[PDB]
Each structure stands twice: as C-alpha cells, then as structure tokens.
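Quick question, first post here. What does this chain look like in 3D?
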Amino acid sequence: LHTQVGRGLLGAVVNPLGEVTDKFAVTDNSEILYRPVDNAPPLYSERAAIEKPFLTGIKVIDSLLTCGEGQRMGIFASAGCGKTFLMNMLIEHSGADIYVIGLIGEAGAEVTETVDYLKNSEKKSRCVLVYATSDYSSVDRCNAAYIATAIAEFFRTEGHKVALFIDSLTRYARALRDVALAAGESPARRGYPVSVFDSLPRLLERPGKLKAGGSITAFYTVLLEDDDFADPLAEEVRSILDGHIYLSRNLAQKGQFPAIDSLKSISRVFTQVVDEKHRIMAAAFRELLSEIEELRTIIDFGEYKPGENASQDKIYNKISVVESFLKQDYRLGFTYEQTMELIGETIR
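> Answer (accepted):
Ran it through. Tokens below.
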C-alpha cells in the first residue's frame, strides 16, 4: 500500500514488491521517499486542459495523431506488430523529463529485452522500470501497474513532464480478474460499494496535467486477438482513453515500420494541440492516404491500367513518397519542423 519513489530510482529496475533489483544506469541522486500506491485521481478542479503537444519524434504520430501533455493514449496491437519497438521509439525520440515503464509481462526474457534496451539508451538516466514476470501472483502483477503509476505521480508533483508506459493493460486486467476471484467477485456479480474491477478506471484516470504540477502522458498497450479483433477489455479501454494508435498486422506483413494504420487511429486532442496550417496539411494527407487505399483495392481488382485515368496515375505516382514518409528507421527521430516539411513535400 506504500512504495518507494524519488529521484534515487532513476536508472533502477523495480520488482512488484517495490524493491530495486537491478540498475541500467547509476545516477547522482540518492533521494528515496515513500508514498501510497493507491493515490486518488486528480480532482476535476485540479486538472488542466490538454493544450500543449507531446512531440514523439515519430513522423506519422506527430503529423496525423499529435499527442498532448497529460493525454492517455492506447496502443492496440497483435503479437509481432512491433509494439515494443514503437515503445522504444516513443522513449528515445520524445522529449519527456522522466520515463516510467511498467512491464506487466510474462517472460523474464521480455523484461531483459527492455533492460538491455535501456542499458544502451540515451534516456537511461531518466527512466525507471517496474516489472512483474509470470512467476508473480495476480496481486503482484497488479501492484506493478500501481507502483509504476505512483512513481510517475511523485515526479509529476515535483513539476516534471513525465511519460508513463503500461504494457500491458491486457495482462493487468486479466490479473485483476483473478484478484477479483479471490474476493468472491466475477465481472457479472461484482462487490459493492467496492469492486476489485473498479481498479481499472481508477488506474486510468491518474494520468493528466495538474494545474499545480507537472504532467503524466500515458501510453497503455492493449494486446489484440487474431486478425486484430478487440475483446471487451479492448473496447472498454478504447472509450476511457483520449485516443488510440492501432498497429496493423497487415501493415507489418508488408514491411512497413512503424505498422501504424493512421486511418484507424486517432488523437482526440489533435485539434487542441496543433495550429491551423498543420491541421490543413494533415487533412490533405489523410485524404491522399484514403485515395491510395482506394487505388490499392482497384489494383487488386485488376481494374487499374496506366494512362486510362490521369487522376489514378497521379495517385499511383504518389504511393512511393507516401510510403517513404510513413516508414521510419527506429533509430531515427524527426523534429516537428522536419516532419511538417516532409509531409508538405508529400502532398504537393
């Protein structure tokens, strides 16, 4: 019910008991304090409206899905869609003060993958990793999510621009269902006034930007089933968050990385965090993508023949510059100016 927080956790790997078990960076600060893990969500009069962008360095996100400081964004993906590499990019190419990762995963190998990434990351001195492997109980799996959030909330109270990653809500929620069973609850017969299942919306409302403090911008991964179908957990989470990035198994098969399907993704704060000329270019690019998709299915239907339709020929000759804009080397980050300069070149 209480855990370690503070700048002394920067560079540390924390287990579901609040224990430091490993380090991927050593830092100057030794500050170690104690805060409750079941912190209340910000009262409505304390939240500030999302109006400043959280730049990610990822071309398609910053142009078409622009995030905001304090926003909660879902990442929806099937296995093998580069979810982890997208998270790595979001850490490496954004500009947060402090990154807090909560791995609610299954394999010890998964945690070490992330530790090894952090060990060679330019951001190692400002990240904290919290983990729970498959060995741990459902209670410990859940507490890992609560510990990552509490650590991030401390840094927010200090005034920091914090980015929080929970991977995954799927395994958190499934562990939470197990904990509910210990209390005698099922999703159809819930306890009252306190249900174990209420920890899910409570966990998701803690991010945001405080009027009197910093911000927590949160990315929650949701693991999709077969042909990218969304189970009830995925649909419930889609309605609570402030947007979602959809990773398409169909874009991944084709060698597009990041496998973000822009037309099935959205940032609900988009128009609040970019200016008019950005909005205009984004709208023009999305229509170009929609026209490209329309030409892809005409091609698959065997209906495209060059020189028949000058409009189709122009859309066809745009496919290569559009694909080049979308794709991104995972070691590469782009400034906002570079991204808007590139996208403008694409729609001319």
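Residues 275-348 form one domain.
The chain has twelve helices and 14 strands.
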